[PDB]
Amino acid sequence: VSLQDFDAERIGLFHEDIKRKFDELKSKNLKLDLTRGKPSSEQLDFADELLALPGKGDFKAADGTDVRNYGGLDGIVDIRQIWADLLGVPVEQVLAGDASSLNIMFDVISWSYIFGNNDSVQPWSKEETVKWICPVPGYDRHFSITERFGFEMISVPMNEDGPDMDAVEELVKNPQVKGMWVVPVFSNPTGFTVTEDVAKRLSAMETAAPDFRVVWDNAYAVHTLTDEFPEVIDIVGLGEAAGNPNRFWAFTSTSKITLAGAGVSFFLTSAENRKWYTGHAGIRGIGPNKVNQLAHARYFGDAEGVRAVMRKHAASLAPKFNKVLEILDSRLAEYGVAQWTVPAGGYFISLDVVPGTASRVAELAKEAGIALTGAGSSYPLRQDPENKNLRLAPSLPPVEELEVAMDGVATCVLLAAAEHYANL
Amino acid sequence: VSLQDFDAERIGLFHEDIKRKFDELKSKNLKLDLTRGKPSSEQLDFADELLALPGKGDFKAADGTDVRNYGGLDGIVDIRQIWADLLGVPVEQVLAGDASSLNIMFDVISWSYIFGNNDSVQPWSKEETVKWICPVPGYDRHFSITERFGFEMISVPMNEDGPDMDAVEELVKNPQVKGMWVVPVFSNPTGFTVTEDVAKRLSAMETAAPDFRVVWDNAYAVHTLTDEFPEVIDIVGLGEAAGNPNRFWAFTSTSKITLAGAGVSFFLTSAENRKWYTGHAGIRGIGPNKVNQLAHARYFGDAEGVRAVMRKHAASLAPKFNKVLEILDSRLAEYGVAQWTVPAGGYFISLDVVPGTASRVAELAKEAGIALTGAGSSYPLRQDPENKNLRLAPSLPPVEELEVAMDGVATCVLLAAAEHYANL
Ligand SMILES: Cc1ncc(COP(=O)(O)O)c(C=O)c1O
Ligand SMILES: Cc1ncc(COP(=O)(O)O)c(C=O)c1O
């Protein structure tokens, strides 16, 4: 019997039962935080050597470029080739920037708004209405960019194999629709991964806008919890093969590989998109930081060197995800109140509680000294229409803290569920 | 006797002789370049240690921030404080960014265009016409930004004490005029420096636009050629004292102090302007590269350490400027065909030749294998109405190449002038 099928008296009693546990949880006086989707100090220690790279006397890229001096908008060949080899794409596709791929995403959107993109009839700022496809649950920092530009964000379900392509293929037939966000591998926060079939559908679909763009933000391209690395779909190539070469603006970075905020970002896109981008970037400045790019190239040496680092991250993160999953199972399984993802990579676990209770869960956790990301945080304008989803971030705390914190979260899920069904 | 005073016969003899020298110059098959204000490899060698900084295990800012991990939009206190001490301003004024000040100048104009600034009644995108004041000769990369945005650029003289304030003060009465560029110390390319009197006038003037900004791009704030450091006017503080606290967006950077394109940029402005800036920068991303900021704080240690570096730069650069000036004196002075700046600091000499001939001098030079910046490059839209100005960049080449290159340039000046007088 799930809680929802408890009779009126049984759920009342269950409510009194679980409230005793909640009282015990509060008497612990916890101060714990499950909100931070960032690497732990242990993981940042792996790149300690990078703090001393590229090192005295070592300032030449593989083509002879003095990385210390001005110029070059594309990034240095050394780091571009490593990433091309890692991702299995032609090097010509790859541009290497500064330390933030979000910065580049914002820029390409803002330039499409101001100037138009290379396929635009006119700039997006001339449109009465710009709409933007948002697979949910998704990444708050993506949705914040589109919200700040005033675009009407239209949600679609993020499914196990990627965004619901029936819904997307329909929505893009509206010319107001100028693009879409997706995190295609270990998606933030669902852990779901776009299949080859879904990528093909995104690549071949017809859009009403001539200048429609998919942001393919492959932020977790190599970020496995296991020994297996996920497939890297050459999405820019798929767009080229389908006859929509300019469709995909693809990104990734080293922020959860080396240093979070001081890594190197990459922008992968078609020939025509890259000329558009560097023509605007060349007015914004002289070009990106080549020294940090050479530092990175030296640290990794080659693509296998990147995978070797990712195995260290996996070994550090795996027990943390395991603890969270173990606790959710032991406390909640029997009750039919919640569903959670079981990801094989990325930085998050996505938890769905009783619809109408996610805000209450986060409130109860807060009264108990446990910080959860708020209800709706993974949705545009922070509006989850079912008030059910919560994001869990296991990476930073030690396992002992995760155990305590999740045990408390589970109690909160149960109490909120008991309140909800008792009030019905 | 000046060349203009030669009679037909004497200018005909002079013309044949200088033409012969020019032919002799072309026969050398030179490949020399006086176009880019890039530090030499000798100057870049000074920061060899920075390639190893901040070094293994050293990753905490002075307030405890782990610089390896996400967050913080303002830059770290370590570098902000050093720059504050260097410039004699309160640390609260200073924001520290990534490796390009141009990126930030671009960004604040683009955001004023898109969103409006904090004093705007509406975005500049909604204006029929945006005008922008451009002291000339000035910096080509500034003008490119406002050209790219479609702003109508209105020229005013850059005089020895700064922009023509009688002209500026009149132009700013037009509400179409939204801002102005200035390089206020050792200006690119005149070497001129804004006086306290001119600064005060800029701070007190009445503008018809409520959201007018001066870009005070102090790229050469400490960039002495003589080891005497120029005055640092606290321009933000002067706007605050005059009752126009939001007027100034001030910038500087370490691109010509440490590593050109891998240094640290600074944005100095009022509390309300900083809040507006970081509000938008926080949507564009999670914040700047804190590791490079700590590397720079470790490299310099303090304000005096910055000043010691600048003295090394002066020792490297001063004999290159001196050689250029010696050649201009010995080849051109007697003929009354040219005038040039004699800068106490900065990266350039500004050369004015016979009006109507600058484009010809640059074409002659290019035929002879000597790259000069084109005619008009220090003017908006590359439009020098007198076709007389050329910019010379002595920093990159060794003195021996400067000698050869400048002797050639002088022969080009004289041939162009001889053609001009003979054609009358
Ligand atoms: C999907 C996604 N993209 C981008 C980022 C940030 O990347 P960067 O640090 O290169 O801006 C994150 C950080 O969590 C993320 O989850
Ligand atoms: C006036 C001026 N501003 C800004 C810059 C460069 O700024 P950054 O390298 O910090 O973009 C230069 C480069 O010399 C310059 O002459």
Residue numbers in the entry:
A (entry chain A), B (entry chain B): 4 to 427
Sentences from the paper on this structure:
Aspartate aminotransferase (AspAT) catalyzes the reaction from L-glutamate and oxaloacetate to L-aspartate and α-ketoglutarate. AspAT utilizes pyridoxal 5’-phosphate (PLP, Vitamin B6) as a cofactor and is the most extensively studied PLP-dependent enzyme. Among the five classes, AspAT proteins belong to class I AT that is further divided into 2 subcategories, subgroup Ia and Ib. In this study, we report a crystal structure of AspAT from Corynebacterium glutamicum ATCC13032 (CgAspAT) in complex with a PLP and citrate molecule.
In order to elucidate the molecular mechanism of CgAspAT, we determined the crystal structure of the protein at 2.0 Å. Dimerization is mainly mediated through the contact between the core domains of the two subunits with three α-helices (α6, α8, and α12) of one molecule in contact with the corresponding α-helices of the other molecule. Because the citrate molecule is stabilized by hydrogen bonds with the highly positively-charged residues such as Arg39, Lys41, Arg144 and Arg394, binding of the citrate molecule seems to mimic the substrate binding of CgAspAT. When we replace the Arg39, Tyr142, Arg144, Asn191 and Arg394 residues by alanine, all mutants showed reduced or almost complete loss of enzyme activity, indicating that these unique residues are crucial for the binding of the glutamate substrate in CgAspAT. However, CgAspAT shows only 10~15% amino acid sequence similarity with AspATs from subgroup Ia and subgroup Ib and exhibits unique structural features not only in the auxiliary domain but also at the catalytic and substrate binding sites. These amino acid sequence analysis and the structural comparisons reveal that CgAspAT does not belong to either subgroup Ia or subgroup Ib, but rather should be classified to a new category, subgroup Ic.
